[PDB]
Design a protein around this ligand. Sequence first.
Ligand SMILES: [Cl-]
Ligand SMILES: [Cl-]
Ligand SMILES: [Mg+2]
Ligand SMILES: [Mn+2]
Ligand SMILES: [Mn+2]
Lengths: 153, 154
Amino acid sequence: ELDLPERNLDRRELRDLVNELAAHPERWAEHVMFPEEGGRHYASLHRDAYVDVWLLCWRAEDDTGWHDHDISSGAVRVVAGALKECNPRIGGEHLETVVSEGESFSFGPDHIHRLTGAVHGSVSIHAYSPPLWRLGQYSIDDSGVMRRVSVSY
Amino acid sequence: GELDLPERNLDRRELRDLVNELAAHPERWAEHVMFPEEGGRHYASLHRDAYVDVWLLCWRAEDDTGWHDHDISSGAVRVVAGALKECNPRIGGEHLETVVSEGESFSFGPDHIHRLTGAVHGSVSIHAYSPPLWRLGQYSIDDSGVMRRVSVSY
Ligand SMILES: [Cl-]
Ligand SMILES: [Cl-]
Ligand SMILES: [Mg+2]
Ligand SMILES: [Mn+2]
Ligand SMILES: [Mn+2]
């Protein structure tokens, strides 16, 4: 568990949190894992009524798929390696940005994105407030029509 | 007024049955038909409880829902009079459009993204959602073209 405030954090406070956590490897180093399993490894660092914090360790294959975080704001800090964040554009030519170690970003509740194209062994820290208990996963039937499946987390 | 329904969330076909059952019973909704004369569509709640959410809608030719989802709510719609256009979004920008005419009904599961437009002035429709429609996602686009989803509370 982390020792965080007993309230919701806005996106700039989430960004401060993921960046200060990056500078405190004591909070997360023991949770760094890359399975011979295949499959993306998650590690929860903190979950309470206000904030969720995760440590993600990325393989080159990992893809979040398109999704929003319902009512959760969030922030991401890349600790090692690099990620690609994709934002959806009506038309099909999505904007893609590479986020490298040391760099971070934040988003509000209306955000839709996809995190993918990771360097193998990449590590990142993700923080959400309110907690990420629901997320919407966007899919496309081969008829082209998009849907949003709201999933627990 | 109370509705004799299972004490649970209803699937999309049970909602469709419900809206068609209600349509065939004018005694329950004819009272509440009223067509407004500015922007705001006129909504009339026929029944809301812990499982279901039933509305009577009266459309003007302008009325547009905008692109939106219903979060985790399944839904059904029966057009009582007039006609509605149901748009479904496609990647590529060429969205699917379907005219739903008086007497016809459709239903959808909880993953549905659509847009409803009044295709004929004076139209009347009955909508049912389950679970209740407490939050809705309304999609918008920047000039940049990037899509966002604003979770609204109705
Ligand atoms: Cl994220
Ligand atoms: Cl609807
Ligand atoms: Mg009831
Ligand atoms: Mn995300
Ligand atoms: Mn709708």
